[PDB]
């Protein structure tokens, strides 16, 4: 019913589910809770890696001006990741903040044509809509089919004011001329924790069918798909906030009693309709 293997999996789940910008606090908590560093090291590396990966952790390679996104798609598999833009190889150290000692990565250069266009075409989209955003487009071959994978990340961490937030968007473009199919997932997570624990957890899954033309053309067609879908998503979110605050919230608890004055407790403690 209980085993060290189960405790390790539990510890791992907690660690990989830390909210943005709070990995260490959660890790230290779990470490003191598990109270067995030998077991903790069993899945640490795996935990750290998975976290940074699903969190699209923006990292800065030794000296490229390189804010690159750590994702699965860039996971070499040997303990190193891909930087499709600068196109090098970089080893990411999970505990420490830095990832250094890069390796040139001469490519396959098959889908790269599309890849390089979308990348800096999207890089423009991002600079226009994400205050502290970064993007990484992956050109790759997925079991025969060519696909462009653009990953966008944006965050704001203010622990001294007890809050952190992050945006994550992933668009998978699978090409099948003339027209191709789109698949994406938009994600938002916000955490406020001064004398409480409040969180916005939201995500939207979208699938689209797009017409494929040129290289610089299909790219701008994509950045357009994304722009419209993400603006629509964000729009639906601000609207939801509006309704929750002016309809749902007010339907829960009134601001003042129906009697329209604070409660007369002496009256509640005695005065009856009849017994």
């Amino acid at each position: 019913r209980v085993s060290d293997e189960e405790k390790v999996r539990i510890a791992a789940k907690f660690i990989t589910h830390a909210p943005p910008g709070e990995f260490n606090e959660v890790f230290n908590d779990v470490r003191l809770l598990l109270n067995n560093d030998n077991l903790l090291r069993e899945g640490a590396a795996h935990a750290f890696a998975q976290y940074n990966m699903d969190q699209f952790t923006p990292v800065k390679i030794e000296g490229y001006d390189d804010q690159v996104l750590i994702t699965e798609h860039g996971d070499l598999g040997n303990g190193r990741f891909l930087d499709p833009r600068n196109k090098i190889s970089f080893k990411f150290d999970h505990l420490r903040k830095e990832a250094s000692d890069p390796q040139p990565e001469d490519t396959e250069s098959a889908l790269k044509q599309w890849r390089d266009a979308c990348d800096s075409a999207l890089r423009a989209y991002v600079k226009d809509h994400y205050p502290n955003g970064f993007c990484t487009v992956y050109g790759k071959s997925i079991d025969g089919q060519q696909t462009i994978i653009a990953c966008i990340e944006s965050h704001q961490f203010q622990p001294k004011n007890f809050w952190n937030g992050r945006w994550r968007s992933e668009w998978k473009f699978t090409i099948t001329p003339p027209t191709a199919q789109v698949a994406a997932v938009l994600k938002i997570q916000v955490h406020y924790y001064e004398d409480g624990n409040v969180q916005l957890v939201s995500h939207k899954d979208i699938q689209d069918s797009v017409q494929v033309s040129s290289d610089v053309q299909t790219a701008k067609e994509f950045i357009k798909i994304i722009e419209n879908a993400e603006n629509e998503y964000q729009t639906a979110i601000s609207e939801n906030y509006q309704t929750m605050s002016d309809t749902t919230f007010k339907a829960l608890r009134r601001q003042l009693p129906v009697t329209r004055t604070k409660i007369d407790w002496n009256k509640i403690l005695s005065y009856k309709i009849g017994k």
């Binding site: 560093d37 090291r41 640490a44 080893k91 150290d93 505990l95 998978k172 698949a183 899954d205 699938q207």
Partner: protein, 82 residues
């Protein structure tokens, strides 16, 4: 600044690594920061209650709800998403 699992390319002690996570643990502890414990029972392996209605239309016992439900049946396991 510097990197090396154990081989250490540069001529240095390089005692830093993934170790920083074991420590010797401090024996001293608060023990009782504040008054509160309400020690009681619980061990029984059981817990049933749940509310009534709140979730959209879909539950009961629907284990279905994933990308590409069909697997090891079609010609290929082509997936629109991942």
């Amino acid at each position: 600044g510097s990197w090396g699992c154990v081989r250490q390319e540069k001529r240095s002690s390089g005692l830093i690594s993934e170790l920083p996570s074991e420590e010797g643990r401090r024996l001293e502890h608060f023990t009782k920061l504040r008054p509160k414990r309400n020690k009681k029972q619980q061990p029984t392996q059981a817990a049933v209650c749940t509310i009534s209605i709140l979730p959209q239309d879909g539950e009961q016992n629907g284990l279905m709800g994933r990308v590409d439900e069909g697997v090891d049946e079609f010609f290929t396991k082509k997936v629109t998403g991942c």
